[PDB]
Amino acid sequence: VKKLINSQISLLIGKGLHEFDSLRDPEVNDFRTKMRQFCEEAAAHRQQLGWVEWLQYSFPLQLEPNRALLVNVKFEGSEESFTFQVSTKDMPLALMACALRKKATVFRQQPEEYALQVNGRHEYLYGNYPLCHFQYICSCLHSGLTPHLTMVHSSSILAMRDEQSNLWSLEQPFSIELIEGRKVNAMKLVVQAGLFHGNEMLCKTVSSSEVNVCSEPVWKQRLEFDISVCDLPRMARLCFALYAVVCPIAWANLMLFDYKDQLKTGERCLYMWPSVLLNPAGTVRGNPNTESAAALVIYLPEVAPVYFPALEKILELLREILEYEHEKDLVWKMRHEVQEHFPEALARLLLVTKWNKHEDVAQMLYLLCSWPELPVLSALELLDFSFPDCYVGSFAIKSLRKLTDDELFQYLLQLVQVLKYESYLDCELTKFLLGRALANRKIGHFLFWHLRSEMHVPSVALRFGLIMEAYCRGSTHHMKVLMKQGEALSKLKALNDFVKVSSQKTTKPQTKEMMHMCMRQETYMEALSHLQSPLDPSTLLEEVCVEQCTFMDSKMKPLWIMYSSEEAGSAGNVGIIFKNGDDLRQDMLTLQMIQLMDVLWKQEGLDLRMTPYGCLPTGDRTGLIEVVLHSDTIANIQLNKSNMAATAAFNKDALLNWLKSKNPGEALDRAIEEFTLSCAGYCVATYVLGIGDRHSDNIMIRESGQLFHIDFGHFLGNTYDFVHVIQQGKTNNSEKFERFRGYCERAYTILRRHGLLFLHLFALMRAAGLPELSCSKDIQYLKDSLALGKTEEEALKHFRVKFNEALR
Ligand SMILES: N#Cc1c(N)nc(N)nc1N[C@H](c1nc2c(F)ccc(Cl)c2c(=O)n1-c1cccnc1)C1CC1
């Protein structure tokens, strides 16, 4: 009956749905019911979409941020093809018109009823864009390859759609009773408790009295906080810290209001988390491992049945140079003038608001409702934990509904990490991400994997697991599509684990050939084959080419899997790298910013030929990396293999000879250009992000000439082989070196004008717990490298010195 789906979901998300049931939590069950109908209604909307509107859902256009061109078009039934000549100028419609003209004038006698599919890929060319704005065409024009498209009728598209369906009174001081506990340590135990409105204290913390090490201690000590109960904001969370003293032990937080605005009472057991001193950013749900978690019971006094006031009761109630408390007063001040004439300074007004005073809040929340929507940029800042308030969040999400699916896609990683700053399961952000994920399958694809990859993490396991379940209710088909991806990753791990065992007992060629025998098994063939790339859902992974597969002799023995597509031709020759043992989250992040840099640069006419390859964690220290084909490490090139076309008299020539071998005579001129531009781009990206530990074996170069970085283990601060290529070999070519210096400088200014975009995004990534990005000013390096507390003309003066430092 309907049980297969629930089992499929359980397997997919990696946790039984019976486990959600076993909680007997009304919040959990109200989420699973509210979001289910939400996701089900979204699925109903989908099946009504026009066949073009449905293409947008399943196959979102992948675009770029006079010139003739060779196309190859074939139809569905017959494998017969036609080769036209169109311009990069032309729309897809004019091409489809040509497709019909040649078809009719050979079969013997309407473009609007068709869509061009990219052969052997989950991509479609449509809309009123010139062909060169499509990234498949732009790719073909960069490799000299010929686009191979396919005329698909609207009738068979509709067949796909159908195939893929289914009280201000309480003035007393706030108090709690610290009863007993159960711990482990050598001394004296003590309980520090603090009230927080996010990253700020509502009042000063209070500690318990010292109670000794052995036990199972007890206090029964009533803790009174310097704040009244009618002044606790809606997002008041009480944060307990426990440590030994003559040594940290455990911490735990919780909201002083339940998920229905009711004031918390009376007794609650707090299963604490290990520590490292208070941690308000931490989760407000207990350590799931009750079997071994240090516990802390407390008592919240009754005070009557008190809810938090509804919104309709909150109804009640020079500067400029600032853009100190006397200053803070001079930005609390004319509250109304900010809204009236400085709407985009809301964030600075929201943190001068006295959140420990219900009136200063109600007056702030009054302005917020009449507040005009802000740009996407300002909204990304309001999402941070330093704006924890209930209504500030909704205002931020309200100002992100104008996000384009390509904008949302660029930021989706950060929006997902913010989910950890939440206090309740049902939020505006979750409802927003699910809504967008269900309207764009590409968003939904990466929403799923970003959540699935962290299901091994106890603190987010419940939330992320529930979000995915909800999403699955909204797409029965993608779940099955994602199941196939999971099943492939499952065998990739088993294969990798075997390769780890085998290479310890024997050598590479024996393990490689026995690796191949493992892959040749039916269960492995019918699992690694015919799936959408988790790295890129539009990229299809059809036939696994076992003979071409292998592994690296690193310590983690990462796998090298190649594919081929009996349709896509050369576009179907693609590979993926399976890695198990390392954390690939920071690598994905760096590649997300380099991609952004590439977009920002491209959105001003600067194409530095960057290679932002795919990187996706899929599980615990498990992820995938897109193979950049036709490339090689500088190490292997400068190694200077004997009697090979890079045979050089000097080490300085090993690279330029390698290019000359791959780029004959006149084709070289463009290879030097690809190199110079890609070099400049990654020099800047390296500098801005502070990517360290660079050397000949983590820098790679494409046969096109494009150089690109790999292996991003450390960032944010934690040679005349390029100059020789850039200068064409000539010892003195200032004109060709100054143009490189030119590329770098302009590439740096463009990022500075968008420095706040990178800033806010990294501030949201603090929620990831990346070792290299966790301190509340690890982001300092980024502000320095970008010189953001400063203007352009002289930032390109400071940028100069370091360029001259790196030059010598
Ligand atoms: N990251 C990355 C990345 C990437 N996206 N695309 C390519 N093409 N290579 C990349 N990394 C290279 C690389 N990585 C591998 C891997 F990870 C797993 C399995 C294998 Cl069997 C290899 C492999 O053979 N190489 C390699 C070495 C020497 C020459 N050419 C390739 C650099 C590390 C040696």
| CA distance from start to end of the chain | 72
Structure-token pair, residue 199: 């990253």
Structure-token pair, residue 432: 């927003």
Tokens 């302009």 correspond to 746
Give the pairing of strands 68-75 and 148-153: parallel
Burial of residue 499, with CB atoms counted within 10 A of its CB: 0-12 exposed, 13-18 middle, 19 or more buried: buried
At what angle are helices 734-752 and 668-689 packed, to 10 degrees?
Answer: 40
DSSP string, 489-557: HHHHHHHHHHHHHHHHHS-HHHHHHHHHHHHTSHHHHHHHSSEEETTEEEEEE-EE-GGG-EE--SSS-
Determine how many CB atoms are found less than 10 A away from the CB of residue 798: 11
Rounded distance from Cα 677 to ligand 1 centre (Å):
23
Rounded Cα gap, residues 752 and 792, in angstroms? 8
At what angle are helices 668-689 and 585-602 packed, to 10 degrees?
Answer: 120
Residues 35, 60, single domain; the answer is no
Residues 75, 139, single domain; the answer is yes
Amino acid at 524: Y
Q: Write out the H or E segment, with its range, that includes residue 181.
A: strand 173-182
Residues 614, 735, single domain; the answer is no
> In whole angstroms, how large is the CA radius of gyration of the chain?
30
Query: Which residue lies with its CA nearest to atom 24 of ligand 1?
Result: 552
Amino acid at 392: V
Query: Which residue lies with its CA nearest to atom 10 of ligand 1?
Result: 627
Q: Which residues contact 554 (CB under 8 A, 6 or more apart)?
A: none
Rounded distance from Cα 409 to ligand 1 centre (Å):
27
Amino acid at 619: G
Structure-token pair, residue 76: 């569905």
Query: Which residue lies with its CA nearest to atom 15 of ligand 1?
Result: 552
Domain CATH code at residue 534: 3.30.1010.10
Residues 88, 157, single domain; the answer is yes
Rounded distance from Cα 624 to ligand 1 centre (Å):
12
Q: Which of 483, 401, 473, 427 is nearest to 44 (CA)?
A: 473
Residues 639, 782, single domain; the answer is yes
Domain CATH code at residue 462: 1.25.40.70
Q: What are phi and psi of 175, to 5 degrees?
A: -140, 155
Residues 645, 725, single domain; the answer is yes
Rounded distance from Cα 629 to ligand 1 centre (Å):
10
Residues 335, 419, single domain; the answer is yes
Residues 636, 728, single domain; the answer is yes
Q: Which residues sit opposite 270 in a β-bridge? A: 296
Residues 286, 406, single domain; the answer is no
Rounded distance from Cα 447 to ligand 1 centre (Å):
27
Last residue in a domain, options 309, 334, 349 = 309
| 211 three-class SS | strand
Closest ligand 1 atom to Cα of 629: 8
Tokens 């006397």 correspond to 326
Contact residues of ligand 1, CB 6 A cut-off: 550-552, 558, 560, 577, 613, 625-628, 631-633, 636, 710
Taking a C-beta distance cutoff of 8 angstroms, is the pair 531, 484 a contact?
yes
Rounded Cα gap, residues 228 and 266, in angstroms? 17
Is the N-terminal amide bond of 266 cis, ω within 30° of 0?
Answer: yes
Structure-token pair, residue 633: 């490490």
Mutate to test the pocket of ligand 1, among 536, 555, 579, 625 (most ligand atoms within 8 A of CB): 625
Last residue in a domain, options 309, 342, 360 = 309
Rounded distance from Cα 207 to ligand 1 centre (Å):
54
Query: How many domains does the chain divide into?
Result: 5
Torsion of CA 465, 589, 411, 427, to 10 degrees: 30
Q: Which of 664, 481, 494, 536 is nearest to 62 (CA)?
A: 536
Query: Which residue lies with its CA nearest to atom 5 of ligand 1?
Result: 627
Residues 244, 234, single domain; the answer is yes
Rounded distance from Cα 571 to ligand 1 centre (Å):
20
Rounded distance from Cα 560 to ligand 1 centre (Å):
8
User: Measured on CA atoms in the order 271, 273, 275, 280, is the torsion positive or negative?
Assistant: negative
Torsion of CA 690, 692, 696, 697, to 10 degrees: -110
Residues 481, 613, single domain; the answer is yes
Structure-token pair, residue 328: 């803070």
Structure-token pair, residue 414: 């950060």
Burial of residue 266, with CB atoms counted within 10 A of its CB: 0-12 exposed, 13-18 middle, 19 or more buried: exposed
Last residue in a domain, options 627, 643, 666 = 627
Q: Which residues sit opposite 211 in a β-bridge? A: 189
Query: Which residue lies with its CA nearest to atom 29 of ligand 1?
Result: 632
Q: What are phi and psi of 67, to 5 degrees?
A: -145, 105
Rounded Cα gap, residues 440 and 445, in angstroms? 9
User: Where in the sequence is the domain holding 735, given as residue range(s)?
Assistant: 630-808
Mutate to test the pocket of ligand 1, among 554, 577, 708 (most ligand atoms within 8 A of CB): 577
Taking a C-beta distance cutoff of 8 angstroms, is the pair 701, 730 a contact?
no
Residues 451, 353, single domain; the answer is yes
Structure-token pair, residue 161: 């759609």
Structure-token pair, residue 6: 């629930």
Structural method: X-ray
Amino acid at 566: E
Domain CATH code at residue 803: 1.10.1070.11
Structure-token pair, residue 572: 């179907």
Over 593-652, what HEC string results? HHHHHHHHHHCCCCCCCCCCCCEEEEECCEEEEECCCCEEEHHHHHCCCCCCCCCCCCHH
Mutate to test the pocket of ligand 1, among 500, 533, 552 (most ligand atoms within 8 A of CB): 552
Rounded Cα gap, residues 415 and 419, in angstroms? 7
User: Measured on CA atoms in the order 772, 773, 775, 781, is the torsion positive or negative?
Assistant: positive
Q: Which of 381, 374, 382, 436 is nearest to 409 (CA)?
A: 436
Rounded distance from Cα 144 to ligand 1 centre (Å):
24
